[PDB]
Design a protein around this ligand. Structure first.
Ligand code: ZN
Lengths: 60, 102, 206, 84, 131, 97, 157
RNA sequence: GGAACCUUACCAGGGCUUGACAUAUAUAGGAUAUAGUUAGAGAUAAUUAUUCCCCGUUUGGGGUCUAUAUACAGGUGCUGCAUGGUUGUCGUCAGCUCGUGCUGUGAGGUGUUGGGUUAAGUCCCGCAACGAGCGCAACCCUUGUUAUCUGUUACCAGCAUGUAAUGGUGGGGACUCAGAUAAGACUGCCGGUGAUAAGUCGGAGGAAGGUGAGGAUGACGUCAAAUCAUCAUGGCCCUUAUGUCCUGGGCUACACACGUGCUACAAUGGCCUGUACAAAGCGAAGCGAAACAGUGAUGUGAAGCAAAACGCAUAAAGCAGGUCUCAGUCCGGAUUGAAGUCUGAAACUCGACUUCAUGAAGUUGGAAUCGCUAGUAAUCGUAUAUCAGAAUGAUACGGUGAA
């Protein structure tokens, strides 16, 4: 996303309540996932390609 | 009960190589001549994720994935220093991981 | 937006992840992201030299040792000068990570039994104003005669630079996408051009 | 509605500005941004202009204002009494 | 290790599992170390549960023990019914035909569905209201 | 019911708004007592206007009309005329006895 | 369109008080909210109250007859031929007979004025037993409405 | 898949301009460092502690950032009718085409127009068609039976037994169970019917019968359908600006109109007391127990636990009793007043929850309209994702359970 926003998310805020998680691959501010530290779209693309080990399609 | 036991938990994503490592370890310890308690299968841990499909409004349509973790357990009776040293020395294919408690 | 990704369909059935390692909850995200960093850095540093690599696949046996295998069909060119490019990778990677990277090169035996290689070839050709229909027909014929049991190619975008976008597809043989026990290789590539961007998709049944 | 164990909230810069005004006989107006500061009983009888995002709205503070917050008396959006 | 329980069986229902133990006796029923009547408070469900015995005219001469968990009250009643049926089968081949006639050997594989995305429930969908 | 005129990426001159109203009084002699809602969406997207009219009937019928044009007055004339004609056609469908 | 529906469950012939399917079906029709135990208790208590308001030992008998006093014979089904809708009479089937009866008693009892649960329903049940009340009124209304329009009886397709 | 700050693209204000961030070109000695000061709303600048460090035994060196001059950066600014990628939709509807041959001057047609049959272009026969491909189905994953292998952290039958509450303890592989490997259901078999067919209606065996149930899987194409605001991207556009650092406001504004949900209007109920039965999940700055204080929200404490080991967590409808009497009510709990709880620096605009009082609309709702064929509707709770805190939404789990 906005590279400056990515860098500010990476940096240390004045306190943690000032900082929000971002997909550091694409910097999307939201749709985040803690287990993978990236957004829903990046997660879907790369898991679909199989670049995320252990993550396959779910039949339920 | 027992003087002490070595509790070793095998964690993997892949059943095949997890199993392979399991028999590798059981053969490696029976080579050292120690009594063994059976490789005992722990429940598989399934983490399901549901994500949107379209990069925009379409909400009724989604897609589901899992992460599956498969776990086995080995118990070793009458711990031996050489036995523990050999267990730590064993090399191991990637994708199957080991946790050891004395 | 139909046509689920065939690789995703076939994972855990007859395919495997492009990264061989497992770790617990504590290390998973960090190691995952370092793998992503490895790919993006290698591919930046190489597609600076325009190189077309089939895959970059990782093996992590150890929490601090990593084996990066670049798989490609022009291994010597990819190597560069006496592995100086190999170490040009490795030094840069350790300039940001604290692990031991050993890089190996996996040689591709059959360049047209690899959908990704086919796709990269198509994309490079159309990047030099080669006529799309002729390129597609030639590639289809070549790879179909080499021994593949079925092949399908679809390109889309501003073909020949017209205002209106279009998609063109060719195919023959068996391409059974809905079959799960099928061994379907899927490759995607993408051409930047003076008129815009052109997508290339390749399905190949074995 | 903070806990008692936390006590009232006053920003530190505003608080020593209040002490300086308390030690000064001159009743100068204080311009502030911290709308979240509670009116501590000590700072009764002052004049504060609080920023409502556009302009500094002034107030004389009386005793009965105590316990409120500064933003409570600086309207932030204006309605002309008609929806046309 | 007396093995006084002459035969043993298992039974399942919606999400409940029960283990049944046949012993010699006057027909008393012990469930989870509690009285059968006090445990299954609904006389309807108790008749539900004891139906296999009344059909196989064997109540009052075999005592029953039940270890049951999972499911709700109705599910547990069905599970113990199935367990009794299987235990009687394990005892005697003679009751097979009558039990199968009443359907006591084929168990209710019917289970609760799963919720589906885009649906409020397994089958209910969100309101359309087209006008 | 009374008609709901919505607009996207455009600003309503009062001239064109009461133009729309003046074209819509054709309904409240014949059709109003038969419909649930009448929506008229104007959009301005490709240096052109796109109009979507929509009507619901009391007997379960739904009428939709989409048009493009260059000049708002002409587009409204054509689209409202088409809408009124299709509504009349459906009313006659049902009343044919 | 693809007719010959799968065989109904039919296996619930309530093995609780009477080994009778009709009581079970009535309780099921009684149900609100998914509360079978509440329905069963209400129905049992109400029929007991009826059997001692009429003071007979056999409750099955009086319950069944008060049902059969409401089970109808010929009902009205609407078809249409040539743009003309006709309310042709047609003979109901037995299952639909119990259904219509139970529905009518239940609706009348629920919508009546009463103090309590089995109170309302027992009162309605004996009114039906005596062939009077809202339920019997509705039944006879359907009967002779169908009969008042017997001309179209040759449309039974 | 979280608007109190950040988020945030808007607004009123204050700074910065090789920039908040990069890579590479040559200078000349530390970076920002840790903790504070001066003013400040903070960003900020001046500052104080301090340095060209490390590999070499130091200079020269290998690279490193200051701090400069640039190549350059940057943009959530326009165009989805310049595009890739992704997605909805007709539609899990059963269709959509090709090679050769034949046929028509030709656009084309046949195959794929016939009679049967199926959920299906599913299958059989015949037919200038012969074959094939993408679809259908099958192969896959859950669940439904059995067999072998293993019994801890799981399980407990026959034993003893800890007063409990806990398989708790010694014990035990019997069972459940967990998870690997296999068997099993294929119209397989039987009867009738059907063109000796394909198919079709019942029957036997069997946990499962005619696709067992559910999910995954969405053909050629259509709507210039959605997205430049996730990324990528052609053209255009700004370059102390439309960029960027922070303070506050705002996205939470109202005479109004429409859509999606929750709670009700009450007797298959409200309230009070006692008692019973689940599954799936989650825990590392996180779970946080036993107990005590407190009507309560919660508070002190720390056991145990990177967890089928402990914790969230004594599920709720239900059942057994007392009470209410058709009353705008012991129904309804919106609205406001007073005092509290937790989160974090901060919750006035603009958080959740609790205690006490306040007790409105609302009497099953017109035209019109939606969902659902079985563990389904209907209803009752539980868990998760985002998250410091905050769900009636969303995802998932079980209980009761029809017509
Ligand atoms: Zn992302």
């Amino acid at each position: 996303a906005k590279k400056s926003m990515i860098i500010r998310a990476l940096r240390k805020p004045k306190y943690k309540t000032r900082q929000n998680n971002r997909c550091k691959l694409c910097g999307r501010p939201r749709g985040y996932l803690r287990d993978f530290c990236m957004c829903r779209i990046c997660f879907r693309k790369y898991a679909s390609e199989g670049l995320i080990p252990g993550v396959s399609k779910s039949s339920w | 009960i027992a003087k002490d036991k070595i509790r070793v938990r095998l964690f993997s994503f892949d059943v095949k190589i997890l199993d392979q490592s399991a028999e590798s370890i059981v053969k490696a310890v029976q080579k050292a001549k120690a009594q063994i308690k059976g490789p005992i299968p722990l429940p598989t841990k399934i983490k399901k994720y549901t994500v949107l499909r379209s990069p925009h409004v379409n909400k009724k349509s989604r897609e589901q994935f899992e992460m599956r973790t498969h776990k086995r357990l080995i118990d070793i009776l009458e711990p031996t220093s050489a036995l523990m040293d050999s267990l730590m020395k064993l090399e191991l294919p990637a994708g199957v991981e080991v946790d050891i408690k004395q | 937006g139909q046509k689920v990704h065939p690789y995703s369909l076939r994972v855990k059935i007859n395919k495997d992840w492009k990264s061989k390692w497992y770790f617990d909850k504590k290390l998973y995200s960090a190691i995952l992201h370092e793998d992503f960093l490895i790919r993006r850095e290698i591919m930046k540093f190489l597609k600076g030299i325009k190189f077309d690599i089939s895959d970059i696949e990782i093996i992590r046996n150890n929490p601090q040792k990593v084996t990066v295998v670049i798989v490609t069909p022009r291994p010597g060119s990819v190597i560069g000068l006496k592995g100086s490019n190999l170490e040009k990778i490795g030094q840069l990677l350790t300039k940001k990570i604290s692990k031991k990277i050993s890089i190996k090169i996996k040689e591709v035996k059959r360049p047209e039994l690899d959908a990704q290689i086919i796709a990269n070839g198509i994309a490079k050709q159309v990047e030099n104003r080669a006529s799309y229909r002729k390129v597609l027909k030639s590639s289809l014929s070549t790879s179909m005669l080499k021994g593949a049991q079925g092949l399908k190619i679809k390109i889309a975008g501003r073909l020949g630079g017209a205002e209106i976008a279009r998609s063109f597809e060719v195919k023959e043989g068996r391409v059974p996408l809905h079959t799960l026990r099928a061994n379907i290789d899927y490759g995607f590539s993408e051409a930047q051009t003076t008129y815009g961007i052109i997508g290339v998709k390749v399905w190949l049944f074995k | 509605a903070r806990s008692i164990k936390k006590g009232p909230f006053i920003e530190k810069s505003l608080y020593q500005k209040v002490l300086s005004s308390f030690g000064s006989e001159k009743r100068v107006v204080i311009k502030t941004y911290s709308r979240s500061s509670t009116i501590i009983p000590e700072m009764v009888s002052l004049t504060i202009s609080v920023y409502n995002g556009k302009t500094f709205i002034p107030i004389y503070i009386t005793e009965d204002l105590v316990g409120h917050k500064l933003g409570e008396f600086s309207p932030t959006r204006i309605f002309r009494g008609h929806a046309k | 290790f007396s093995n006084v329980n002459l035969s043993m069986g298992t039974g399942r229902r919606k999400s409940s599992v029960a283990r049944v133990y046949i012993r010699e006796g006057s027909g008393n029923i012990k469930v989870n170390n509690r009285d059968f009547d006090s445990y299954i408070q609904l006389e309807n469900l108790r008749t539900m549960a004891l139906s296999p015995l009344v059909l196989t005219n064997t109540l009052g001469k075999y005592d029953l023990y039940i270890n049951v968990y999972g499911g709700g009250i109705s599910g547990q009643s069905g599970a113990i019914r199935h367990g009794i049926s299987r235990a009687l089968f394990k005892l005697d081949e003679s009751n097979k035909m009558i039990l199968r006639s009443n359907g006591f050997l084929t168990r209710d594989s019917r289970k609760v569905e799963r919720k589906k995305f885009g649906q409020k429930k397994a089958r209910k969908s969100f309101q359309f209201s087209k006008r | 019911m009374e008609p709901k005129i919505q607009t996207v990426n455009y600003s309503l001159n009062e001239n064109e708004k009461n133009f729309i109203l003046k074209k819509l009084e054709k309904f409240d002699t014949h059709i109003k007592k038969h419909i649930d809602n009448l929506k008229i969406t104007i959009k301005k997207e490709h240096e052109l206007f796109k109009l979507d009219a929509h009507i619901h009937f009391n007997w379960g019928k739904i009428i939709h009309i989409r048009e493009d044009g260059k000049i708002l007055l002409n587009l409204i004339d054509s689209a409202i005329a088409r809408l009124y004609k299709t509504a009349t056609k459906e009313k006659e469908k049902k009343n044919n006895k | 369109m693809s007719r010959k529906n799968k065989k109904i469950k039919k296996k619930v012939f309530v093995d609780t008080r009477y080994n009778s399917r009709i009581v079970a079906k009535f309780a099921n029709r009684m149900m609100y909210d998914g509360k079978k135990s509440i329905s069963e208790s209400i129905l049992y208590s109400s029929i007991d109250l009826l059997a001692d308001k009429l003071e007979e030992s056999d409750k099955m008998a009086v319950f069944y007859k008060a049902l059969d006093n409401i089970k109808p014979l010929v009902e009205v089904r609407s078809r249409r031929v040539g743009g003309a809708t006709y309310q042709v009479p047609v003979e109901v089937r037995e299952e639909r007979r119990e259904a219509l009866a139970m529905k009518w008693i239940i609706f009348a009892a629920r919508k009546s004025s009463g103090r309590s649960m089995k109170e309302k329903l027992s009162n309605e049940l004996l009114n039906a037993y005596n062939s009077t009340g809202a339920a019997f009124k509705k039944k006879e209304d359907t009967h002779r409405m169908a009969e008042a329009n017997k001309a179209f009886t040759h449309y039974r397709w």
